[PDB]
């Protein structure tokens with residue numbers, strides 16, 4: 349493997365903190381839960397601490413810890429994400445919503461003590477007033493997808509590209525093209541992978557006891573695409 353994967357053999361508590369501005373709508377989200385990379389499993393509850401979320405929850409799922417992906421044993425030499433731990437990595441994305449605006453995100457993912465933390469800044473521009481995002485026309489659900497990873501050896505890191513399809517309430521789909529880059533924060537060696545993908549499955553729900561604007565997420569992520 350890598351030395352960093354030793355930090356992931358058990359259940360790890362997670363904290364997520366996001367500050368956002370989409371078209372001048374300022375918001376924050378705080379999340380808590382845990383990850384168990386042995387099973388590729390994430391359980392997180394997110395709360396909008398500023399009030400009502402000004403964009404649909406599903407549009408934030410990808411932004412709101414791929415170090416919890418399950419890498420099969422035969423592929424463990426391809427796990428960049430854990431290899432960068434505990435010092436962590438910077439994750440940047442451009443998320444381009446077809447016929448609408450874009451999110452640019454910058455996150456730092458690292459350990460703070462025994463807790464894995466994801467700190468994010470999100471900026472959204474050029475959204476349509478009553479497009480699917482600011483008009484809240486997206487269903488509260490989520491389709492499975494693959495995250496296609498490639499090495500970026502000049503930057504000592506990785507890139508990824510994938511497509512999210514958000515279901516629109518009228519039966520159509522809102523495409524969200526994702527371009528991602530990750531670079532280590534520390535100077536220790538990291539694993540630079542062969543092309544492969546992360547198979548991701550996400551289920552969204554609500555806490556029946558929660559009155560704040562929130563999202564409960566159950567996610568499974570498994571690396572694939574390299575055989576033996």
Ligand SMILES: [Mg+2]
Nearest residue numbers: 449473474475
């Ligand atoms: Mg302009």
